Ligand binder design. Structure first.
Ligand SMILES: Nc1ncnc2c1ncn2[C@@H]1O[C@H](COP(=O)(O)OP(=O)(O)NP(=O)(O)O)[C@@H](O)[C@H]1O
Ligand SMILES: Nc1ncnc2c1ncn2[C@@H]1O[C@H](COP(=O)(O)OP(=O)(O)NP(=O)(O)O)[C@@H](O)[C@H]1O
Ligand SMILES: Nc1ncnc2c1ncn2[C@@H]1O[C@H](COP(=O)(O)OP(=O)(O)NP(=O)(O)O)[C@@H](O)[C@H]1O
Ligand SMILES: Nc1ncnc2c1ncn2[C@@H]1O[C@H](COP(=O)(O)OP(=O)(O)NP(=O)(O)O)[C@@H](O)[C@H]1O
Ligand SMILES: N[C@@H](CC(=O)O)C(=O)O
Ligand SMILES: N[C@@H](CC(=O)O)C(=O)O
Ligand SMILES: N[C@@H](CC(=O)O)C(=O)O
Ligand SMILES: N[C@@H](CC(=O)O)C(=O)O
Ligand SMILES: [Mg+2]
Ligand SMILES: [Mg+2]
Ligand SMILES: [Mg+2]
Ligand SMILES: [Mg+2]
Lengths: 466, 468, 465, 465
């Protein structure tokens, strides 16, 4: 049993989709049990996001009409450049047309009403994967192989109704997919999406097609999860930021999860958990360079001579400093802070507290800042050591980034902290926050956004290039 | 208005008590309004803690009487060696006797009942100061000046009834002391203690005689709060760990507060709060070197060339690592963690979170580990792991063989290069950093290392940043 | 300052709308300061509810089209039948046409989107009053008097945004209406709608047009609030259940409120609070029998010889019995039960608890049963040695609540005995009793099938003696 | 396997203790597996309660000394009058002396410190059973039988640390007692007490000795639990209130549990659950009339013609009326009320809600009134446009709860009518009714002064006929 997941650029044109179909069909000969997971064509999820908000805010029906045309022309072109059979192209076009009509009505409804609920937002977003998967499945059929396209819920991924990033509730993957695999059919499953218990389409979070692959692998007790992307594995850093980045042949589950979580886009952080608890290896491969060995992700852990295998960053974060009202009790005041933040579903990335004033430092997603301050005003409302006030003030610095350094044995490595932070200084970066102790393999810290490149480059020179 | 506080060693013997009385009476001829705060004689609060526990655990009444004779003879000897007047010795002796009768009555009651409530414990501990204040007062009277001994509550410190570490609710310092300063009386006030609203004696936490002084100073709008200890101010580190520790002439409120809070025993961390919010300057002085300038703590803040002015430690802490169940939401699971700990009144010193598994690192006071472990089991109900399962916490580990080291100075957080310099120094000392806190304080960086490596680490940091 | 509210049947045709405008213009000559509150025409709110559900569920645009034609034809007919002046008819028709357009757009939007939010439902429902109010207003102008139609929000009713049942947050009634009355104009204000702080149209709950009148009366410091309906005041019970029901000339504020709350449709329960707050009397009158004295509602209270002055019923309820796991602590499990139910916004009507097993009986709205069950599932999950609080839960939907009301109830000796022997003499079996928490009300639960008989028997013994 | 529990009056003197040892010794010959549970001698627990408070409030040491002499003389007399053997008397007196020594020190501690925590009370209270059990065990040994006295904790009863009314956590009975029974030993276990996990003595609540018997019975899978008291079973009401009370030969678990819970002092309410869940019969017998059949409590349930087999009362209760701020949401305001009361461990006995104002009626223990008022003010603090939940709260302590119990109560047509007309003819005025939540029980509140007359009237009507 092999699950093969392909990303947006891997299916970014018809030529590409057909290439992907050939990779799948070749694997089919080695392992007769193949499930494919597929994302939306490159950039369409982004376009779906922007048109939803345009349809909501400006409410312009010509603008929606232009989007539809672009989406139609792109997927028609894909079909024509991916499939040779007239019969198959015709049946794929029929499905794409059906989805496009459905897409159009909903977008017009949003504009008529000036209303876009999280539920409707998830539904619109689902169209990306639901437009690409019939094409890939058709292209596999065109190559003489049995195939059908399926949505994530009907493939067995059941979630709660937290539209935006629904958590997975239940898996019916074996029930839904085993009958298909037994008839020798290659199911092409939509990434990114699941289903609510009542059948409402749900998304799993941006990047979530990787997670779908792991969920389907876990559910089927798969032999391997193959992540097919546009780089040859996980690298020592984002190869788009630092050209001298190197492929890491082997990574542990925890190393990989920490890297993904702290900004390595190649893997959605939630990909690791299901594979990890069933011991299913993950292989990250390049669809544009299929002979490359990529990165194999397993339980195997080895330290490297220098301690730091990789560097990741998150840019879309803010630094929130809460000022305490003196020695008012750190556990009592944190309890109320995090109650408020939790109630509001604010995503906190990093926590530090070491202050007689009961100040606390927090990194949150930049989009969650207003929700955080909102939540904090509700909790504490609006001085003196004799009153019962816990909080004095709050400051937020949005012009900031989190940099994380990851390698086995990190926490236990003597001298590594010193080496990290003197290097950070030498790049010209000024450290606003540090987190160490809660991870076996990770050190994270905050610097000014402007210094991100110089800092990553210097860390890369010191630890990877030597 | 000047308030002078004297520590246990400063009043460690009758001779020492008189020397202290002399210091005060020399100040009364510079400032007419002098209020004294005094601690129990050296080592007696500890003795009281230990006899309390013994009266509860072994319940031997002959063993109580052995302690009563020790306290009697120590305070009698002190009266003898502090005061020259026979009338005053007789006067002070009666007060001491009356306190000893009450002490014995309660230690026996605890042995009879077999129960020691925080209320009873707070009463027992208050005897340290209620025995020393009349002796010092008597010594001041002996040097020809008016003086009476007072307890914290009747000096105007009102608290809640959280016996052990009562928080100050309310101040009546001016109401209580003004009529006495007005008549030229030097009140000798018991540090460490205050009163519940219905009159029950309460303690303010260990080391809280420094805090009493600040509360009185605040209550009086005092011109200066003088802390008289057994070192010539606040030093670059503990002079007993590092003999080459240097006196720091000047310190800002926030620097001293962070130092005290992270292990500088010279000041109880709560001392700064009331002084700072009225701008009352704190002078830390040596009773055994009264000519020394000491340390002056004010709003004045000045960066040191080598950022890092002082180094402090806490030994009596434990490192608790909470292992999360995966990506389960840090704020939500932090909310539940800190609720449980807050409910149990667990003292958390340091927090660090940076983990895809929702792990969190915690430093707590060492004696709160059982409370914390208890609180978390109630909160989370101990199973798993499954990503489909709704559990939040996978496991918990504690390491009590740990210490926290803190490094303090005006430009700390804003200073480029300092963290790397600190942590390379820490490694050069042989230590393995288990936790780091940076960001939440302007002047402080704290980290956790193995307890065995404490001295060497402090030595290396003091070498690199202070000595040169 | 007189506020006059007219119901759906009272403005249930063009002819009736003109008769109403004739009552209003007659009042204007006694009180120069008159404000009209008007409901949607009879049955249109109901039709609006069903077309919303239809637009969401099947999503047929042609069925929406058929509805727009019904709502247009209905209201065009009314304009032609209420107003003489051709100019005013054309004036009122343009207002109606603008509303229909807005209505059509939302209903198409709902069908295209496949989602009907509470915000969208409230907007759709509001069209009823927003269509009927300019027809009444135009008819008032057709009788020679100055008038304009306003919405509840623009007339000063500001609410939170709990769409469907929004709570009144703030009033600007005096501020917006006083200038209109200063010029001699008669405002015709829409009944069950308010506005959010940002101008979103909100509804006040079914029946809420009576509540608007009380709200407008309160804000204006009115001298009287007049409720015009199709019965001559509050009766000893529903005259549709019992032909021989009697008009009650006078009722106290608390008596009226308990009756309404426990099912006397003539008044929305929330009508009483604003009135009672400022001691503004409420007069309930029959538009079809205008010379009847009807019912005067004030602070005046007086016991009947036979305590028990009225009987009310609620049919659309369920009896929920929660089975405790033994002596597990009543206030603690009660805490978790009502937390869960509060969280799910479940409407509980009645609570009884008196059980060594920590059992508890609840009456809830029949439409709240699924929510309620779901909440208790989420809350409780799933020996005397484990910590389980709940054993099981049962629901009986084939149930009704009957309430008896009159001054002196709780304090009158023997009345509980007389009530329940009567109930028994009707053939009914009592499933739950509430007594103690009201000075003026006793409530109890029986099988739905015994409703009419029990009401009749109660009316026999206590009213017709 | 038989558990035999004897109450305070049953062991209220030395002659009585010896008579009890004879009943146990007779049973021993029919069933070799006998465990005895015993209470403190009559009135001793109350004496311990009063001298505790005196030691706290007045702190007179010679007054404690007078108590010690009273306790010593009583128990020395019981020893002399119960046991013939000098050697056993000597051996029991030595045990009694250790306890009295310990008891005297504790009470002197209380006066010295001027403090009495719940932990200390339980410890002091436990001395009653720890003083009588050695005497009874001595008397059993005096009659040629092997016997040892044991405390509840060491017999296998482990509780949480809720001193005063600790909940049973864990039972270890088989483990501790089975080895004793196998050697022919009759364990005499102190009723009323358990042990915290770390060894602290805990009480199970007043009346708790009955509960101990059921716990021990459940723990051993006993064939029967014998509750030996000073009446011949459970009666139709308290025979001390109504001399014409009749013994009820047979009761179901639920009938006996509801009655106990609602005031039938003969059984602690928690007695029934452990027996019920293992189907162990409870036989209630008279130690002064051992030949009477008593009352047998099992699963068997039978309706009586008059439905109402028994009337119980609770006197030490208060009626709390919480006044709501209006139509503010009952589930939501109920949520906050029961949270506050649950947090303060307030024992609520009865609940009724049925009010348009969100009023709620509550019956709580009379001792808990201040707890409840303090918690309510902590929850809510001190216009309809205001998000207020609670207007006010009044308490009435001059109140009692009356409960009527019998199989088929809830499903019986006409019974409520009959009950409440009877209440009226007693001259009582009903302040609260609870019905619905129990299959076998109807409860209501009246003025405390009307209690005797109400019970008598109910008894006349339903029992005597
Ligand atoms: N440490 C890293 N190693 C490798 N690639 C990285 C790393 N960090 C960031 N990246 C970037 O991650 C990209 C792959 O992620 P992504 O753009 O999501 O492709 P995908 O997952 O195949 N497509 P989709 O399924 O539509 O999200 C690469 O193009 C890299 O630029
Ligand atoms: N940074 C520091 N500077 C100076 N002294 C320090 C520092 N850190 C720790 N110490 C120690 O703290 C001691 C003073 O504290 P302590 O003995 O409690 O003072 P005290 O207030 O005079 N006595 P008491 O009032 O009974 O607590 C000194 O003797 C030092 O050994
Ligand atoms: N005790 C009662 N007294 C009088 N009428 C009652 C009573 N109980 C129920 N009703 C019914 O209540 C009806 C009046 O309310 P109803 O007509 O439904 O509201 P309305 O205010 O007149 N119109 P609308 O504004 O659209 O609600 C009467 O037709 C009666 O059938
Ligand atoms: N319905 C009832 N039937 C029988 N007795 C009742 C009833 N209601 C109350 N009682 C009283 O309950 C008393 C028995 O309980 P109680 O006085 O606790 O005896 P005990 O349990 O044997 N002694 P102790 O173990 O010290 O509590 C009887 O004397 C009756 O007066
Ligand atoms: N297509 C989705 C899911 C994914 O790319 O993994 C997104 O743009 O986020
Ligand atoms: N409170 C006194 C006594 C003590 O804590 O030991 C002090 O400041 O030291
Ligand atoms: N027309 C609205 C308002 C009312 O009837 O009072 C409704 O049907 O509920
Ligand atoms: N002796 C205890 C226990 C009992 O009587 O059952 C009491 O007085 O309550
Ligand atoms: Mg991706
Ligand atoms: Mg000190
Ligand atoms: Mg109506
Ligand atoms: Mg009893």
């Amino acid at each position: 049993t092999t699950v093969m997941k392909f990303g947006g650029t891997s299916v970014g044109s018809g030529e590409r989709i057909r290439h992907v179909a050939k990779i799948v069909t070749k694997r089919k000969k080695e392992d007769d049990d193949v499930v494919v997971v597929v994302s939306a064509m490159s950039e369409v999820t982004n376009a779906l996001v922007e048109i939803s908000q345009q349809a909501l805010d400006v409410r312009d029906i010509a603008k929606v009409g232009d989007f539809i045309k672009f989406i139609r022309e792109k997927h028609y072109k894909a079909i024509e450049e991916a499939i040779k059979s007239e019969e198959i192209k015709e049946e794929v076009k029929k499905i794409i047309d059906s989805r496009i009509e459905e897409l159009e009505k909903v977008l017009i409804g949003v504009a008529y009403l000036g209303e876009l609920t999280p539920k409707s937002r998830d539904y619109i977003l689902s169209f990306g994967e639901r437009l690409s998967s019939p094409i890939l499945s058709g292209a596999i059929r065109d190559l003489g192989e049995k195939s059908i396209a399926l949505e994530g819920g009907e493939a067995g991924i059941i979630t709660d109704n937290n539209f935006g990033s629904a958590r997975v509730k239940r898996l019916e993957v074996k029930e839904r997919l085993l009958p298909l695999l037994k008839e020798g059919i290659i199911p092409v499953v939509t990434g990114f999406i699941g289903t609510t218990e009542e059948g409402y389409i749900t998304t799993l979070g941006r990047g979530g097609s990787d997670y779908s692959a792991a969920l389907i692998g876990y559910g089927l007790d798969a032999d391997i999860i193959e992540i097919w992307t546009d780089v040859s594995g996980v690298y020592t850093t984002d190869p788009r930021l630092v050209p001298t980045a190197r492929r890491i042949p082997k990574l542990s589950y925890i190393e990989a999860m920490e890297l993904a979580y702290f900004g390595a886009k190649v893997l959605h952080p939630r990909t690791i958990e299901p594979a990890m608890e069933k011991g299913i290896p993950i292989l990250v491969k390049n669809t544009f360079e299929p002979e490359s060995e990529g990165t194999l992700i397993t339980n195997d852990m080895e330290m490297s001579d220098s301690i730091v295998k990789a560097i990741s960053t998150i840019k879309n974060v803010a630094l929130i400093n809460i000022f305490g009202a003196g020695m008012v009790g750190v556990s009592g005041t944190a309890a109320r802070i995090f109650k408020a933040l939790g109630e509001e579903e604010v995503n906190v990335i990093l926590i530090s507290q070491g202050s007689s004033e009961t100040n606390i430092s927090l990194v949150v997603s930049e989009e969650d800042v207003d929700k955080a301050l909102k939540a904090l005003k509700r909790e504490f409302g609006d001085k003196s050591f004799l009153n019962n006030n816990l909080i004095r003030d709050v400051s937020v610095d949005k012009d900031v980034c989190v940099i994380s350094v990851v390698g086995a044995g990190m926490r236990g490595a003597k001298g590594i902290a010193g080496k990290i932070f003197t290097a950070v200084s030498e790049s010209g970066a000024n450290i606003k926050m540090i987190a160490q102790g809660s991870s076996e393999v990770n050190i994270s810290f905050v610097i000014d956004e402007k210094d991100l490149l110089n800092c990553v480059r210097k860390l890369h020179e010191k630890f990877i290039e030597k």
